[PDB]
Design a protein around this ligand. Structure first.
Ligand SMILES: O=c1ccn([C@H]2C[C@H](O)[C@@H](COP(=O)(O)O)O2)c(=O)[nH]1
Ligand SMILES: [Mn+2]
Ligand SMILES: [Mn+2]
Ligand SMILES: [Mn+2]
Lengths: 138, 141
């Protein structure tokens, strides 16, 4: 069963712009393009969250159906974020698994006042350099 | 499984299912089905999305500066950017998970529309992504 990362690979092949299979340093125009796509998708999510917060400040009780535009824009952001990893030739699932393992290890840490999970004493970061080296050879 | 099961090798978890595991582990809200959020949850999700976006941008800028000055970039030089892009995935999935919205279901519908459009400009009979229908269907699962 395909992953969302593999879906992006299929999409790029379908638009005739097949992407490398292994990590590949990109030309500058590729980085600038991916940055623009990330910024526009981030701005759409940001605007929608501000929009929902303003409705709540007005006293409206949101329903689940009110969440459809935000869910759509969040998925569009996933699309362009996976898309950036795919055009770099970087297996997003392998990097994500490393990041996830180093996030589960934060469970014993304290929380910030806004709810952000913080790092416990002694915590050590994900080793994404090692994942990249793993993907680069085989 | 039952006494007849002689092997059990499940499909690996999706990245969306990983966010559910993380939020369970840290005691954060992770509803099974779509759930309107308190404003405090929306504010946190915004903060994490802004923070992760800023970190990605910082790493893209570092790469552009190094290659501008002639540096030969190896695959290993992409590791900070890849880490920050994975963090951005993480908090984007994380917002969908805290809303009780199956990110894989929503992504699959966005992908269906995007992949369909690539076979056309739109092909005949093209249907845009119907995320509203996905959330309704998730409510009745
Ligand atoms: O409340 C939290 C705190 C951290 N993270 C994940 C997202 C990133 O992968 C990474 C960011 O953590 P910091 O490095 O900013 O502390 O942890 C969350 O998803 N929710
Ligand atoms: Mn969009
Ligand atoms: Mn980060
Ligand atoms: Mn951070």
């Amino acid at each position: 069963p395909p992953t969302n990362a593999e879906r992006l690979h299929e999409f790029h092949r379908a638009i005739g712009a097949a992407t490398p299979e292994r990590p590949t340093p990109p030309p500058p125009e590729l980085l600038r393009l991916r940055q623009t796509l990330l910024d526009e998708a981030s701005a759409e999510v940001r605007a929608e969250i501000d929009h929902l917060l303003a409705r709540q400040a007005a006293g409206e009780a949101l329903s689940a159906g009110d969440l459809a535009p935000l869910a759509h824009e969040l998925a569009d952001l996933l699309y362009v974020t996976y898309g950036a990893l795919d055009q770099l030739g970087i297996d997003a699932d392998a990097v994500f698994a490393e990041v996830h393992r180093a996030n589960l290890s934060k469970a014993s840490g304290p929380r910030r006042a806004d709810g952000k999970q913080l790092k416990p004493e002694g915590w050590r970061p994900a080793d994404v350099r090692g994942v990249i080296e793993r993907l680069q050879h085989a």
